[PDB]
């Protein structure tokens, strides 16, 4: 009885971990295929066990072998169990496995949804964000449709971290359901007004991608993006908006016509050479688009070529 548990613990002590696995494959590079086959059989048997921690370390090695490129989808239900553990220290491992291993053509796409809405409903922000990450790398259509009802409120979370991560996962949710976009588009605009700059930027990139895919949704939002740059001070956000406009100016010449002056001022105030080049290229595109009928783009191109020199 107790001695059998002691024997199990001793075997666990003689069991390998992810680090033990990597050390072994390093020591057995010549016998790599044989060693990994033996290890995968051991992992199958240790998943046949009921120790959640042993199965979690098995999932660690399985995710590693997934990085080494081997089939572990046979233990997808095991990974489900691991991510369903009461301790988040194993939920991280399970979600990390599922993010790079699960596939929308499988049954995990419907078997898991309860854990997702539980972890999202979980007040502790870390697990909720981790589940959001796992879905961001593994969300399926039925999953996104059934989860958006909660994720939209998650976008209203107290802690901004959940809000940004939720907006970023919502983008892919839109990529699988514009049926969510139609009602959430005003909510996305509202999130664009989150006092925290981070949630702001999350909504910023989401809407930039949305416009990139559908240029039918930015026309009324052009002043919004203008005010959005002007309030924006972060480099990557500024670059993203400027690139959106480089994608929008050929469709609306007047938009670039208005944008050129504040963009020129930004070029005056720009200190990052990376932002400098992007601004230069975008305004060159704008000047090319506008050159029909505005005989002063020569001065702007002159400034641009001073910058290029």
């Amino acid at each position: 009885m107790a001695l059998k548990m002691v024997k199990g613990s001793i075997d666990r002590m003689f069991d390998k971990n992810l680090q033990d696995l990597v050390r072994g494959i390093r020591n057995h590079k010549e016998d790599e295929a044989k060693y990994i086959s033996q290890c995968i059989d051991e992992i199958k048997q240790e998943l046949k066990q009921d120790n959640i921690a042993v199965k979690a370390n098995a999932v660690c090695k399985l995710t590693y072998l997934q990085m080494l490129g081997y089939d572990i989808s046979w233990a997808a239900f095991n990974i489900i169990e691991v991510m369903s553990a009461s301790k988040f220290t194993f939920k991280r491992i399970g979600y990390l496995a599922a993010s790079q291993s699960f596939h929308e053509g499988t049954d995990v796409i419907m078997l898991t949804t309860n854990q997702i809405r539980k972890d999202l409903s979980s007040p502790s922000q870390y697990d909720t964000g981790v589940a959001l990450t796992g879905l961001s790398c593994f969300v399926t259509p039925d999953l996104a449709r059934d989860l958006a009802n909660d994720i939209m409120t998650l976008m209203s979370h107290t802690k901004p971290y959940i809000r940004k991560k939720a907006v970023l996962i919502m983008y892919k949710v839109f990529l699988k359901y514009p049926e969510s976009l139609r009602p959430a588009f005003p909510r996305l605009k509202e999130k664009l007004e989150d006092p925290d700059p981070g949630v702001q930027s999350a909504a910023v990139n989401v809407i930039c991608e949305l416009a990139r895919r559908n240029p039918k949704n930015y026309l009324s939002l052009a002043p919004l993006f203008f005010k959005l740059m002007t309030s924006s001070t972060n480099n990557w956000v500024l670059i993203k908006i400027i690139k959106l406009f480089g994608a929008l100016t050929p469709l609306e010449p007047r938009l670039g016509k208005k944008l050129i002056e504040p963009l020129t001022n930004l070029i005056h105030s720009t200190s990052a050479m990376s932002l400098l080049y992007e601004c230069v290229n975008t305004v060159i595109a704008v000047l090319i688009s506008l050159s029909s009928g505005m005989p002063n783009h020569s001065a702007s191109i002159q400034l641009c070529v001073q910058k290029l020199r």
Partner: protein
């Protein structure tokens, strides 16, 4: 004690599980996936796995047969038109070789409705008397009021455990 607990949709599986947990009746949505919780009753810890009862999720019941030590079938007596579908599901489930050495506890739920059918006719309809090599039991249960829960728990612990 790993327990796999099954049933049909809108039967009362999740309500029973949460009432077992914390002693309250919770608002329930259809269980598309599954829920897992560990139950400690009579100094014995039970890991009861509530699977979804929907027809669409029924094919995926194969995956949780592993290492399962007990089966529980939440029976909706108010849902008299689905007693058939219940009995074919139970017959197909017991046909699996993986659950040959598990135990089966039957929960005749929804007894508050006046149309509820007694556990004896539940046994007759499900054919529990025809079970061979199978220690089994049946009891009338009520999810909202709780009646019938603890004695079934005592029964399950009685067969599963080997000592006090």
């Amino acid at each position: 004690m790993r327990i796999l607990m099954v049933g049909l949709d809108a039967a009362g599986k999740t309500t029973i599980l949460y009432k077992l947990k914390l002693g309250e009746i919770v608002t329930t949505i259809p269980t598309i996936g599954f829920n897992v919780e560990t139950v400690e009753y009579k100094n014995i810890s039970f890991t009861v796995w509530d699977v979804g009862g929907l027809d669409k999720i029924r094919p995926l019941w194969r995956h949780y047969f592993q290492n399962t030590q007990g089966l529980i079938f939440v029976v909706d007596s108010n849902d008299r038109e689905r007693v058939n579908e219940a009995r074919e599901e139970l017959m197909r489930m017991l046909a699996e070789d993986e659950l040959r050495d598990a135990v089966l506890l039957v929960f005749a739920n929804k007894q508050d409705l006046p149309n509820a059918m007694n556990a004896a006719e539940i046994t007759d309809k499900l054919g529990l008397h025809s079970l061979r090599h199978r220690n089994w039991y049946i009891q009338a249960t009520c999810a909202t009021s709780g009646d019938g829960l603890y004695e079934g728990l005592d029964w399950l612990s009685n067969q599963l455990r080997n000592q006090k």
